[PDB]
Design a binder for this molecule. Structure first.
Ligand code: ZN
Ligand code: ZN
Length: 81
C-alpha cells in the first residue's frame, strides 16, 4: 500500500500496525534519521505525530520546541496608564 507522504519511498506496508497504517507513515520513517522530504531535511515529531523541519528541532532532544523547550511566563509590557 503506497500511502506514505514521504516521496521516493520504497517501503512496503503490506503488514503494518494501525498506528502506521492510520497515520500513513512507515515504522522506519517514524523513527528515522532525518528523511529527505521536498529536498530539505524533515524529521518526525512524536509530540504532535506530524512532520516538522530540522530547523525546528534542536538540543539533544529530537522533539518539538513547544512545551519541551519551555516558553515560560516572563513579561512583555508594564502596567500603568
Ligand atoms: Zn515511507
Ligand atoms: Zn510537533
Amino acid at each position: 500500500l503506497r500511502l506514505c507522504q514521504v516521496d521516493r519511498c520504497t517501503a512496503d506496508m503490506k503488514e503494518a500496525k494501525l498506528y502506521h497504517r492510520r497515520h500513513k507513515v512507515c515504522e522506519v520513517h517514524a523513527k528515522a534519521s532525518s528523511v529527505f522530504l521536498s529536498g530539505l531535511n524533515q524529521r518526525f515529531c512524536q509530540q504532535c505525530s506530524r512532520f516538522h523541519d530540522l530547523q525546528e528541532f534542536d538540543e539533544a532532544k529530537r522533539s518539538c520546541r513547544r512545551r519541551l523547550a519551555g516558553h515560560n511566563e516572563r513579561r512583555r509590557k508594564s502596567s500603568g496608564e
